[PDB]
Structure formats: structure tokens, C-alpha cells
Amino acid sequence: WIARTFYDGPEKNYEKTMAILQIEAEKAELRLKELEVRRLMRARGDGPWYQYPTIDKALIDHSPKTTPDN
Amino acid sequence: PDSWDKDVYPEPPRRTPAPAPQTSLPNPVTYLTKIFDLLVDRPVTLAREFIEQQHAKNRYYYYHREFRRVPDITECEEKDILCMFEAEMQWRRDYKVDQEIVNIIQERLKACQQREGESYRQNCAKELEQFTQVSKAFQDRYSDLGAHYSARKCLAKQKQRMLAERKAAKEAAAA
Numbered sequence: 001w002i003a004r005t006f007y008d009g010p011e012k013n014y015e016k017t018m019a020i021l022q023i024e025a026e027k028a029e030l031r032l033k034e035l036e037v038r039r040l041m042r043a044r045g046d047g048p049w050y051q052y053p054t055i056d057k058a059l060i061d062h063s064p065k066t067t068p069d070n
Numbered sequence: 071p072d073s074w075d076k077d078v079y080p081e082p083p084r085r086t087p088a089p090a091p092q093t094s095l096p097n098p099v100t101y102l103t104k105i106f107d108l109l110v111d112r113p114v115t116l117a118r119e120f121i122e123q124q125h126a127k128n129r130y131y132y133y134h135r136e137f138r139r140v141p142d143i144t145e146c147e148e149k150d151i152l153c154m155f156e157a158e159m160q161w162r163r164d165y166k167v168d169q170e171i172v173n174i175i176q177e178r179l180k181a182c183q184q185r186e187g188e189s190y191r192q193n194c195a196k197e198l199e200q201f202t203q204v205s206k207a208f209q210d211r212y213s214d215l216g217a218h219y220s221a222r223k224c225l226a227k228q229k230q231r232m233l234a235e236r237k238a239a240k241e242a243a244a245a
């Protein structure tokens with residue numbers, strides 16, 4: 001009576017634990033991947049992150065400048 | 071009683087001597103036994119009969135749980151969390167079963183020690199050897215793992231034992 005009224009079967013806890021373990025394992029591998037990606041991006045600078053600003057080339061004046069040799 | 075399997079828990083045929091009254095003096099043991107039967111066993115037997123016939127009117131069953139076999143830790147990937155989990159649970163269940171096997175053997179040994187009386191040193195040799203073998207195997211299996219035991223630690227212990235055995239066999243055979 002106690003088992004029927006207050007508790008459930010072992011399969012419920014078993015599968016819940018499996019789902020939780022899978023979720024946490026994916027989270028851990030994602031954290032490692034994010035750390036590695038951050039390290040590589042900061043070391044190289046070829047990714048969208050750590051793109052420090054540079055001088056815009058649209059500000060340059062392309063016209064004769066009173067002197068042929070610029 | 072048919073409640074437990076007689077083969078798992080063996081008992082001797084239990085031979086007992088017949089009464090041999092040498093004299094005509096009436097002993098008190100038989101009279102006390104008869105009177106104890108008369109005003110103890112009969113009411114107890116009647117009460118048990120009543121309870122049993124009450125039970126028979128409401129008969130229902132309960133079942134032993136069977137568990138399927140799952141791949142062990144020896145065929146589990148390095149970071150496969152689900153297979154590792156299943157292997158760990160199976161290993162824990164097997165560990166409990168092994169503990170209960172050791173318990174059964176110990177119970178048989180204790181029963182032999184009590185039953186055989188003074189000759190327990192001679193008549194309980196077989197049970198002693200069975201317990202020695204089971205205890206040695208159990209110690210090889212699960213001993214010294216620690217509080218945080220796991221399937222992986224037991225596998226590492228077994229691998230180390232096999233490496234030592236292989237080294238010893240290679241040294242001895244080539245000698």
C-alpha cells in the first residue's frame with residue numbers, strides 16, 4: 001500500500017538519472033569547447049570575438065592634394 | 071518446511087536415538103513434555119489453523135524482479151556517461167549478490183559448527199573449505215577498493231592482478 005500510494009517504480013528514477021547525466025555531460029563538453037574556442041580566438045584573432053577596432057578606410061581622401069607626390 | 075530450498079541450506083538426516091528406559095521410575099521430562107503439549111501446542115495449533123484458513127480466503131501473489139543483462143564496463147566508451155551508468159548499476163547489483171552469497175556460506179558454516187557439537191573440528195571440514203574458497207575469491211574481487219568503490223576501480227584492480235599473473239607466468243614458463 002505504501003509503495004502504491006506514495007512511491008513509484010525504479011525505472012522512473014533510472015531514466016531520470018540517465019537524462020540528467022546526459023544533460024550534464026553535454027554541458028561539460030560544451031564548457032571545455034567554449035574555453036578552447038576562446039583561447040584560440042584570443043591567441044589568433046581570426047574569429048568574431050576579440051575584434052579590436054581599427055581605423056576606417058572610408059575617411060581617407062582620394063583626391064589631388066596640391067602636390068603630385070601626396 | 072518447503073519455504074526454503076533444502077539444497078541451498080543442507081541438513082543431515084538428523085538421526086535420533088530411541089528411548090531406552092532402564093528402570094520403572096517415571097521421569098519428569100516426559101510428563102512435563104506431555105503437559106506442555108497439552109496446554110501449549112493445542113491452542114497455538116488452533117490459532118494458527120484459524121489464521122491460515124482466514125488467509126486462504128484472500129490469496130494474492132508477489133513476484134521476484136528479474137533484471138536484464140547490460141554491457142559491462144569492459145565494453146564501455148571512455149566518456150559514454152549512459153553506458154558507464156548502466157555498467158556501474160549492474161556492478162553494484164552483482165556486488166550485493168556476491169555479499170549475499172558470502173552470507174549464505176557463513177550461515178552454513180555456523181550451522182555446521184553448532185550442529186556437530188564437540189566433533190565440529192572434524193565434521194565441518196567441507197564447509198570450512200567452501201568458506202575459505204569463497205572468502206579468498208571475494209577478497210580478490212572487492213577488497214581494498216575503498217569507500218568510493220566503483221566498477222572502474224575494480225576493473226583496474228583486476229587488470230593489475232592479471233598483469234602481475236602474466237609477468238609471473240612468463241618468468242616461470244621460460245625458466
Ligand SMILES: CCCCCCCCCCCCCCCCC[C@@H](O)O[C@H](CO[C@H](O)CCCCCCCCCCCCCCC)COP(=O)(O)OCC[N+](C)(C)C
Nearest residue numbers: 001002003004005006007008009010011012013014015016
Ligand atoms: C494501520 C496503518 C499502519 C501504517 C500507517 C502509516 C502512516 C502514514 C502517514 C505518514 C505520511 C508521511 C509519508 C509521506 C508524506 C509526503 C509524501 C508525498 O510524496 O506524498 C503525497 C501524499 O501524501 C499525503 O498527501 C500527505 C500525508 C499526510 C496524511 C497523514 C495523516 C495525519 C495528518 C494530520 C493532519 C491534521 C488535521 C487537523 C488536526 C486538528 C503526494 O505524493 P506524490 O508526490 O503525488 O507521489 C506521486 C506518485 N503517485 C502518482 C503514485 C501518487
